[PDB]
Write an enzyme that holds these catalytic residues in place. Structure first.
Site, mmCIF file in Angstrom:
data_model
loop_
_atom_site.group_PDB
_atom_site.id
_atom_site.type_symbol
_atom_site.label_atom_id
_atom_site.label_comp_id
_atom_site.label_asym_id
_atom_site.label_seq_id
_atom_site.Cartn_x
_atom_site.Cartn_y
_atom_site.Cartn_z
ATOM 1 C CD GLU A 1 -4.340 9.800 2.613
ATOM 2 O OE1 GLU A 1 -4.089 9.680 3.799
ATOM 3 O OE2 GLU A 1 -4.921 8.942 1.972
ATOM 4 C CB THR B 1 -6.579 8.263 5.177
ATOM 5 O OG1 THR B 1 -5.236 7.792 5.174
ATOM 6 C CG2 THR B 1 -6.626 9.595 5.926
ATOM 7 C CG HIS C 1 -0.065 10.453 6.865
ATOM 8 N ND1 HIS C 1 -0.900 9.762 6.123
ATOM 9 C CD2 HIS C 1 -0.398 11.787 6.813
ATOM 10 C CE1 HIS C 1 -1.755 10.635 5.640
ATOM 11 N NE2 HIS C 1 -1.449 11.837 6.053
ATOM 12 C CG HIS D 1 2.385 5.852 6.149
ATOM 13 N ND1 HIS D 1 2.061 5.761 7.432
ATOM 14 C CD2 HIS D 1 1.291 6.300 5.460
ATOM 15 C CE1 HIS D 1 0.815 6.128 7.539
ATOM 16 N NE2 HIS D 1 0.355 6.452 6.347
ATOM 17 C CG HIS E 1 -1.838 -1.148 1.283
ATOM 18 N ND1 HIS E 1 -2.833 -1.474 0.442
ATOM 19 C CD2 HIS E 1 -1.751 -2.157 2.216
ATOM 20 C CE1 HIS E 1 -3.341 -2.633 0.808
ATOM 21 N NE2 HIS E 1 -2.676 -3.024 1.877
ATOM 22 C CG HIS F 1 -0.938 8.526 1.786
ATOM 23 N ND1 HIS F 1 -1.682 7.441 1.764
ATOM 24 C CD2 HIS F 1 -0.633 8.797 3.091
ATOM 25 C CE1 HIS F 1 -1.838 7.045 3.012
ATOM 26 N NE2 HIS F 1 -1.207 7.863 3.811
HETATM 27 C C1 LIG Z 1 -2.138 -0.144 5.141
HETATM 28 C C2 LIG Z 1 -2.712 0.053 6.552
HETATM 29 N N1 LIG Z 1 -2.232 1.273 7.211
HETATM 30 C C3 LIG Z 1 -2.774 1.567 8.535
HETATM 31 C C4 LIG Z 1 -2.008 0.661 9.535
HETATM 32 N N2 LIG Z 1 -2.407 1.128 10.857
HETATM 33 C C5 LIG Z 1 -2.858 0.091 11.749
HETATM 34 C C6 LIG Z 1 -4.342 -0.039 11.467
HETATM 35 O O1 LIG Z 1 -4.857 -1.183 12.124
HETATM 36 C C7 LIG Z 1 -4.892 -1.053 13.547
HETATM 37 S S1 LIG Z 1 -1.759 2.390 11.331
HETATM 38 O O2 LIG Z 1 -2.220 2.851 12.586
HETATM 39 O O3 LIG Z 1 -0.344 2.317 11.411
HETATM 40 C C8 LIG Z 1 -2.177 3.460 10.055
HETATM 41 S S2 LIG Z 1 -2.056 5.149 10.266
HETATM 42 C C9 LIG Z 1 -2.764 5.367 8.716
HETATM 43 S S3 LIG Z 1 -3.014 6.944 8.115
HETATM 44 N N3 LIG Z 1 -2.864 6.976 6.638
HETATM 45 O O4 LIG Z 1 -4.334 7.374 8.430
HETATM 46 O O5 LIG Z 1 -2.065 7.720 8.821
HETATM 47 C C10 LIG Z 1 -3.047 4.182 8.097
HETATM 48 C C11 LIG Z 1 -2.709 3.076 8.828
HETATM 49 ZN ZN LIG Z 2 -1.283 7.779 5.847
#
Ligand SMILES: CCN[C@H]1CN(CCOC)S(=O)(=O)c2sc(S(N)(=O)=O)cc21
Ligand SMILES: [Zn+2]
Ligand SMILES: [Hg+2]
Length: 256
Positions: free
Chosen positions: A103, A195, A116, A91, A61, A93
């Site tokens: 985003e 997100t 993020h 990470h 992803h 996007h």
């Molecule tokens: C591909 C999956 N990504 C997620 C993996 N997460 C664990 C989720 O299951 C408990 S996480 O807390 O690390 C986050 S933060 C995040 S964003 N883009 O909103 O910052 C996405 C995800």
């Molecule tokens: Zn993110």
């Protein structure tokens, strides 16, 4: 299973994660003119000087840089938070073209990417308990615009070769996150969600006003990553961002 493509992208996510149609989904549009300036917002405390990075991983992803979060090494406090939130990973996007990739948008303007830095509330004992909570996570989001190179991002860019496909990882010790921050820590905050699936409504979003710029060469290499595992057909990892959600009965507060 979920992704960002025509058959499994954001418009289909509600079918397995009904919360997609919820009341505090992220990202949103930050309309700078109706964001309420709030003068009781304290400044941010970003303490990333003792941070321990361990690994970088392509998870199909995005690619993540994980940090050792077993003691208070890299923490976020202050701002709209009550509590210490510990850094577990960061990470990005990004888009297939430079005019899309963020985003969150500012006045409907989109950036080339968004960073993020994910933190979780230590009150809750482990990451997995904090995602059961309305104030379990704080994500600090930073927009990237194409410009001159960000020296601190280059180390990340060099390793992307060893994690081209879904499931590869490389050790990535001694990375300092402080080189990814803008000069100013002014922000906008509101309550939202992750997100990506599972789209949980756990997050206090702190989106910073000032963007960092990165060269077009740095963000080019992001685009050479793959969504697929090796041996499967090559599908480039681009446009891995969710479109903006309705703010619906939420107020965005500004520290400035
Ligand atoms: C591909 C999956 N990504 C997620 C993996 N997460 C664990 C989720 O299951 C408990 S996480 O807390 O690390 C986050 S933060 C995040 S964003 N883009 O909103 O910052 C996405 C995800
Ligand atoms: Zn993110
Ligand atoms: Hg939650």
């Amino acid at each position: 299973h979920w992704g960002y493509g025509k058959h499994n992208g954001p418009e289909h996510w509600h079918k397995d994660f009904p919360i997609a149609k919820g009341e505090r989904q992220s990202p949103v549009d930050i309309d700078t003119h109706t964001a309420k300036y709030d003068p009781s917002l304290k400044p941010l405390s970003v303490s990333y000087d003792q941070a321990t990075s361990l690994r970088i991983l392509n998870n199909g992803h995005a690619f993540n840089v994980e940090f050792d979060d077993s003691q208070d090494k890299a923490v976020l406090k202050g701002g709209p938070l009550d509590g210490t939130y510990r850094l577990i990973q960061f990470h990005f996007h990004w888009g297939s073209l430079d005019g899309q990739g963020s985003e969150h948008t500012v006045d409907k303007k989109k950036y080339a990417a968004e960073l993020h830095l994910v933190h979780w509330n230590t009150k809750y004992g482990d990451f997995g308990k904090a995602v059961q909570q309305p104030d379990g996570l704080a994500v600090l989001g930073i927009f990237l615009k194409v410009g001159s190179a960000k020296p601190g991002l280059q180390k990340v860019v060099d390793v992307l070769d060893s994690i081209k496909t879904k499931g590869k990882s490389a050790d990535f010790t001694n990375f300092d996150p402080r080189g990814l921050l803008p000069e100013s820590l002014d922000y906008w905050t509101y309550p939202g969600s992750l997100t990506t699936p599972p789209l949980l409504e756990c997050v206090t979003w702190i989106v910073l006003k000032e963007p960092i710029s990165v060269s077009s060469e740095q963000v080019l290499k992001f685009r050479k990553l793959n969504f697929n595992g090796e041996g499967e057909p090559e599908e480039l990892m681009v446009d891995n961002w969710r479109p903006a959600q309705p703010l619906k009965n939420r107020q965005i507060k500004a520290s400035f």
